[PDB]
Each structure stands twice: as C-alpha cells, then as structure tokens.
Amino acid sequence: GSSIPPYNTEVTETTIVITWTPAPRIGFKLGVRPSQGGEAPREVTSDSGSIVVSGLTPGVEYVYTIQVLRDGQERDAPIVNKVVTP
C-alpha cells in the first residue's frame, strides 16, 4: 500500500525543500528539471531528513520526482509532481 514516510514540500522562487522524519534505512531521491528543458536536471539523495535544490530560476515550470528508498532499493512507486517557481 502506502507507507511512504510522510514528507513536507517547500517551494520558493529558487529552492525546493523536502523534509521527513529520519529513520535508519529510509532514504530519499529527488530530481528536478524544467518541463521544457534548457538546463541540467539535478538529482539529490539524502538520509539527513532534508533535500535541498537551490539555484532554480523563478517563474519556470519544473517537474520534480520523489523516489523513496528502502535499504537503497526502489520498493515504492516514484512520485512525479510539477510546480512553477513563484
């Protein structure tokens, strides 16, 4: 089912922040990229409880995908979202 660890998503003009409760074997992989392309797609993995993606350009549509990692394995479905920077 859905035991995705609950996470909070913060979207600013240049930043995307994902936060969750740190557990020993829970990881997160976040990837952002413009919907129309133009720049490099970033990918961050962390167990700290926070993922930071800075340097985004304001006013640009971004597709961002969240991948929960169980023991470094993709056991859950990826979560694809789209947001336009303020």
Curated annotation (Swiss-Prot):
PTM text: Sulfated. Forms covalent cross-links mediated by a transglutaminase, such as F13A or TGM2, between a glutamine and the epsilon-amino group of a lysine residue, forming homopolymers and heteropolymers (e.g. fibrinogen-fibronectin, collagen-fibronectin heteropolymers).
Subcellular location: Secreted, Extracellular space, Extracellular matrix; Secreted
Lineage: superkingdom: Eukaryota
Residue ranges of domain Fibronectin type-III in the record: 2-86
Tissue specificity field: Expressed in the inner limiting membrane and around blood vessels in the retina (at protein level). Plasma FN (soluble dimeric form) is secreted by hepatocytes. Cellular FN (dimeric or cross-linked multimeric forms), made by fibroblasts, epithelial and other cell types, is deposited as fibrils in the extracellular matrix. Ugl-Y1, Ugl-Y2 and Ugl-Y3 are found in urine.
Task of the protein: Fibronectins bind cell surfaces and various compounds including collagen, fibrin, heparin, DNA, and actin. Fibronectins are involved in cell adhesion, cell motility, opsonization, wound healing, and maintenance of cell shape. Involved in osteoblast compaction through the fibronectin fibrillogenesis cell-mediated matrix assembly process, essential for osteoblast mineralization. Participates in the regulation of type I collagen deposition by osteoblasts. Acts as a ligand for the LILRB4 receptor, inhibiting FCGR1A/CD64-mediated monocyte activation.
Disease: Glomerulopathy with fibronectin deposits 2: Genetically heterogeneous autosomal dominant disorder characterized clinically by proteinuria, microscopic hematuria, and hypertension that leads to end-stage renal failure in the second to fifth decade of life.
Binding partners and assembly: Mostly heterodimers or multimers of alternatively spliced variants, connected by 2 disulfide bonds near the carboxyl ends; to a lesser extent homodimers. Interacts with FBLN1, AMBP, TNR, LGALS3BP and COL13A1. Interacts with FBLN7. Interacts with COMP. Interacts (via type III repeats 9-14) with TNFAIP6 (via CUB domain); this interaction enhances fibronectin fibril assembly. TNFAIP6 may act as a bridging molecule between FN1 and THBS1. Interacts with TNR; the interaction inhibits cell adhesion and neurite outgrowth. Interacts with FST3 and MYOC. Interacts with SVEP1. (Microbial infection) Interacts with S.aureus FnbA.
Name of this chain's protein: Fibronectin
Species: Homo sapiens (Human)
Recorded name of the encoding gene: FN1
Residues of the full protein shown: 1088 to 1173 of 2477
